[PDB]
């Protein structure tokens, strides 16, 4: 279930899953905590900007959320987690298998209610501790005491009392002592909601049959009763802005406002949230404000505001109805199609079964917007035909987008379910376009494609005809009729020359779009279900009916690769931006990555929910997938973008049970030397030879034009007096007798020891190794420092060392350079004593080797003479 190429990143498009959100205050500001499956998100109330997300996904879905100042408490299964800034600070694990249901935090006491009517109390270890950690006691409410716990509430000014609210009645427990202080009188109707009022000793209780009760805990008696026949209360909240208003949310999706002082209804907001998804799951007035934040199970979070009254007097009577202020949202049902809007990974286009098309932003959630379905006035002037009652367009089966002409005219085509035309949209304006493309053969639209130039739109019908429209004018231009069954794919190359098509009849058509000719026809074994075309490489893959992906080269019209291993239908697949990988999702709940160069499955995943769509970012950094459950889009990060991935084939039998290294990593390191007889340069920068030969002139250029000014009183040994690193030749220490000019034993350089050692051992391999490593300044210094006085042992040895190096034919350019520096520094010495046998013999042996390396000159001269002639004449 763990991929070696991809890892989860986050979920886009989700605002709230229906669990009641939690409001916390930091100073004057407010923030809202919403639940998103196995994670929560924190929004800024003033802007509804995403601030934090939980660092990791919880093992089980979150059931409750409570936020107090910086700390957030999230309850899942039998554990309660404490988070700060989205990072878990401490996890409270209850000792019973019962799952937590409700969560209450007052003072240092944390109260958690399990589904077996057991209330666990935790307490702060220290009075100044930030959050409660220590387990204090356990209180259990029995059936004789009361019904199932509906919610845990704490009323203000109550010392160590927890107000347990059950379906039958309300109970007052003392957490410090663990004793039942008080039991309320039984209520006829099942209590569903409870909310502490801003008044003392009063808690608002909402029943299952549209009754709201202002129960007074101190007096133990009813104070008021609001009646809402044929409605079920889901939320309650009081206004704290000095106006005695009460907001009642219902499961039908309506939010009613009452004026408690006047005993009147201010207004009702109808269908703010869908009934089918739970109506108004949570509605809370912001403390001390006219703003109310509402949420529901339809993946939406809204805010409404009460404007000041328009009357100069009697403002309490003339109450402005609440006004929509701002909101955030997403799809209410799982997306059906997704696509990347731009070359960068900024925006994505998503379509869902809820008949809405959304533009989602990866970079910032606030930029996400819904594409408008308002229609443009017809150019002809006739009235457009449609029902007066406005409805959303049907579900989108296919989508095609280009950006060559964004802002000039329509740049999106969409296909709808059971609809005989395709609609166009405009990404810049974020609105449906003014053109509609019809199949013209009485068939449904099954395929949509666009040319890279953005001038043409191709529509494939279920009756086998391909119509081609112009996006600027929406005028049909060409119609191709080759397929007899549905056309499930259309593509056109980057050059707008060769067009390809596939259909359920199993044939692949190759056309010449410029000349409108049939280049060829290829028949495959099984019906073709989908196509993806790679414009850079001119390869396209076809998802066949026999559970295969067939890769075809459009230039030569032959199958190049065929991929096997999926055990069920292939829902979707895509090409990697570099054209080297194909990731495909199938109905057997596996996402497989295939390596086209070797044609094998290199990676495999097992998803809990079948992935309907797969899409690479054109950058290649991200992979987006949508699943059969969940309203969001799963974003994965491509680990291949930061390290190499082995292309070894994945184990098939192992993968089923869950349900040469250079070649494997797609790299090759050049050999040090292909053959001993072949001349090979040094493994390093090619400027080293030129620097060594011309060291002085390069350095005279380096010197500043004017002498730096310096203090007269300067330490003579400042360079040595360094608090401690420098690895220069100057900073060398001797390693452990008669005086010797070259060096007395125990006080000689490392280089001189190796030279003397090599002369005795008749092998200078150790010395040649250190010469190549020496820096250009060090090399010049050592050659210049060689002993230049009779019997000239060191000069003879150095010549012998270089002569041995030339025999190796490796690093020869440097050995030539060292010899040139030897003549530069000690040429006069060699010239004066040329007759000396020792120097002459060493020189002669060097010449015998050096005479052999003239073949390089013959090769160099030939290539220029021919290369100059070939290119010229």
């Amino acid at each position: 279930k763990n991929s070696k190429i991809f890892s989860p990143f986050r979920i886009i498009g989700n605002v709230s899953n229906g669990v009641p959100f939690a409001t916390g205050t930091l100073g004057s500001t407010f923030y809202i905590v919403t639940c998103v499956g196995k994670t929560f998100q924190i929004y800024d109330a003033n802007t509804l900007h995403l601030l934090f997300v939980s660092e990791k996904e919880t093992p089980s879905s979150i059931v409750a959320l409570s936020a107090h100042f910086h700390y957030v408490y999230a309850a899942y299964e039998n554990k309660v987690g404490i988070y700060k800034r989205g990072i878990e600070e401490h996890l409270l694990e209850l000792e019973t298998d019962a799952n937590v249901e409700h969560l209450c935090i007052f003072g240092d006491y944390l109260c958690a209610s399990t589904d077996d009517n057991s209330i666990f109390i935790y307490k702060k270890s220290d009075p100044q501790d930030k959050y409660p950690s220590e387990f204090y006691t356990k209180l259990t409410v029995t059936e004789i005491q009361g019904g199932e716990i509906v919610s845990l509430q704490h009323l203000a000014t109550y010392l160590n009392k927890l107000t347990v609210v059950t379906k039958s009645n309300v109970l007052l427990f003392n957490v410090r002592t663990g004793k039942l202080v008080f039991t309320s009188n039984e209520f006829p109707d099942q209590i569903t909601t409870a909310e502490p009022a801003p008044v003392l000793d009063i808690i608002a209780l909402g029943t299952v049959t549209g009754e709201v009760i202002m129960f007074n805990m101190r007096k133990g008696k009813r104070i008021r009763t609001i009646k809402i026949p044929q409605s079920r209360i889901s939320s309650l909240s009081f206004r704290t802005d000095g106006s005695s208003h009460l907001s009642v949310g219902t499961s039908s999706g309506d939010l009613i406002f009452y004026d408690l002082d006047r005993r009147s209804r201010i207004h009702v907001l109808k269908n703010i949230h869908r009934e089918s998804y739970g109506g108004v799951t949570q509605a809370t007035f912001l403390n001390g404000q006219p703003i109310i934040v509402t949420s529901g199970g339809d993946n939406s979070l809204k805010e409404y505001v009460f404007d000041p009254s328009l009357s100069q007097g009697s403002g309490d009577v003339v109450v402005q109805p609440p006004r929509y202020l701002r909101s955030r949202g997403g799809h209410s049902q799982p997306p059906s199609y997704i696509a990347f809007a731009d070359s960068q990974s900024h925006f994505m286009l998503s379509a869902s079964k809820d008949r809405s098309l959304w533009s989602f932003s990866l970079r910032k959630d606030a930029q996400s917007q819904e594409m408008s379905q308002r229609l443009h006035k017809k150019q002809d002037g006739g009235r457009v035909g449609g029902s007066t009652i406005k409805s959303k367009f049907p579900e989108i089966v296919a989508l095609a987008i280009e950006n060559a002409r964004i802002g000039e005219w329509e740049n999106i085509i969409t296909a709808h379910k059971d609809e005989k035309f395709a609609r166009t949209w405009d990404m810049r304006n974020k609105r449906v376009g003014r053109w509609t493309f019809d199949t013209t053969d009485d068939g449904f639209v099954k395929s949509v494609a666009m040319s890279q130039c953005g001038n043409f739109g191709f529509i494939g019908s279920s009756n086998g005809s391909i119509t081609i429209y112009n996006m600027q004018s929406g005028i049909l231009r060409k119609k191709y009729k080759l397929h007899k069954r549905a056309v499930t794919g259309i593509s056109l190359d980057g050059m707008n020359r060769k067009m390809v098509s596939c259909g359920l009849d199993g044939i692949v058509g190759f056309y010449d779009f410029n000349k409108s000719t049939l280049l060829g026809k290829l028949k495959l074994d099984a019906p073709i279900t989908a196509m993806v075309y790679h414009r850079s490489s001119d390869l396209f893959a076809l998802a066949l009916d026999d559970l295969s992906i067939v890769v075809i080269d459009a230039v030569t019209q032959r199958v190049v690769r065929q991929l096997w291993g999926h055990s069920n239908r292939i829902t979707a697949f895509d090409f990697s931006p570099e054209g080297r990988w194909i990731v495909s999702a199938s109905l057997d709940s596996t996402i497989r990555t295939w390596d086209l160069p070797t044609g094998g499955c290199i990676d495999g995943i097992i998803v809990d929910n079948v992935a309907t769509n797969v899409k690479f970012s054109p950058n290649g950094d991200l992979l987006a997938t949508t699943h059969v459950t969940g309203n969001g889009i799963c974003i994965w990060t491509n680990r291949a973008q930061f390290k190499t991935v082995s292309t070894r084939t994945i184990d098939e039998s192992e993968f089923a049970r869950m349900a040469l290294n250079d070649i494997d990593f797609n790299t090759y390191t050049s050999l040090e030397q292909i053959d001993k007889e072949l001349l090979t340069l040094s493994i390093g920068p090619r400027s080293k030879m030129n620097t060594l030969l011309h060291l002085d002139v390069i350095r005279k250029r380096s010197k500043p034009k004017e002498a730096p000014k310096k203090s007269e009183k300067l330490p003579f040994f400042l360079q040595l007096s360094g608090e401690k690193v420098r690895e220069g030749i100057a900073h060398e220490t001797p390693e452990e007798n008669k005086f010797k000019v070259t060096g007395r034993l125990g006080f000689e350089s490392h280089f001189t020891k190796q030279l003397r050692e090599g002369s005795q051992s008749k092998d200078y391999s150790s010395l040649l190794a250190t010469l190549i490593n020496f820096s250009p300044a060090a090399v010049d210094l050592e050659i210049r420092s060689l002993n230049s006085f009779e019997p000239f042992d060191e000069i003879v040895w150095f010549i012998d060392a270089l002569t041995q190096g030339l025999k190796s034919n490796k690093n020869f350019e440097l050995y030539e350079t060292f010899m040139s520096l030897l003549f530069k520094a000690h040429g006069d010495v060699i010239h004066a004593n040329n007759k000396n046998q020792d120097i002459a013999s060493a020189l002669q042996n060097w010449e015998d080797v050096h005479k052999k390396e003239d073949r390089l000159d013959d090769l160099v001269k030939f290539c220029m003479g021919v290369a100059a002639f070939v290119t010229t004449a």
Partner: protein, 199 residues
């Protein structure tokens, strides 16, 4: 200490200077320089090195002894002795303090006769070629190689870093053996630059 604080080889070469005791004999020509400079010689030895210092007038030699109850550095006796010899050999005092302060300064000592058996005027010219007119050639070698040289008749003492005195030694030897003056001066230009370069 600040609150933010972090939580017996002889440097001289060619001559054997070696509760421990060290004895160094002072030649007569260094007696008077030692006397007027003694007020600055014992403080660093007795304070920084925690040695016990003395001169024996009877033997005209200077005595250093490690005090186990006060001395803490095991090498302090040798560093103090290597200090004392440098003043004895002829080096200036501030030049001699570098030995105590630094840990990578070595004195190279040798004679003209070691390089070549020169006698009479041939030996005198060799000392002249090393020194040069007004000491210019010796001045050049010290500046290029960043060393300090004392040319006491046919006895040469070179103080500096290992590679530094290695290059000065070659320059002096070439002057003894008769290499042309231009080749030596040109080589002095190159070694001066090449030593200071990082690469």
């Amino acid at each position: 200490v600040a609150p933010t604080a972090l939580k017996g080889s002889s440097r001289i070469i060619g001559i054997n200077n070696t509760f421990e005791s060290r004895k160094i004999m002072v030649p007569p020509h260094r007696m008077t320089p030692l006397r007027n400079s003694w007020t600055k010689i014992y403080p660093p030895l007795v304070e920084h090195l925690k040695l016990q210092v003395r001169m024996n007038l009877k033997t005209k030699s200077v005595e250093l002894r490690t005090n186990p109850k006060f001395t803490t550095d095991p090498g302090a006796l040798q560093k103090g002795a290597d200090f004392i010899k440098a003043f004895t050999l002829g080096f200036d005092l501030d030049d001699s303090i570098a030995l105590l302060r630094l840990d990578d300064l070595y004195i190279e000592t040798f004679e003209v006769k070691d390089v070549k058996t020169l006698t009479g005027d041939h030996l005198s010219r060799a000392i002249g070629r090393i020194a040069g007119k007004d000491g210019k050639t010796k001045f050049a070698i010290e500046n290029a190689t960043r060393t300090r040289i004392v040319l006491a008749d046919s006895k040469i003492h070179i103080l500096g870093g290992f590679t530094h005195i290695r290059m000065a030694r070659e320059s002096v030897v070439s002057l003894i053996l008769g290499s042309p003056p231009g080749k030596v001066y040109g080589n002095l230009r190159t070694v001066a630059s090449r030593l200071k370069e990082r690469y």
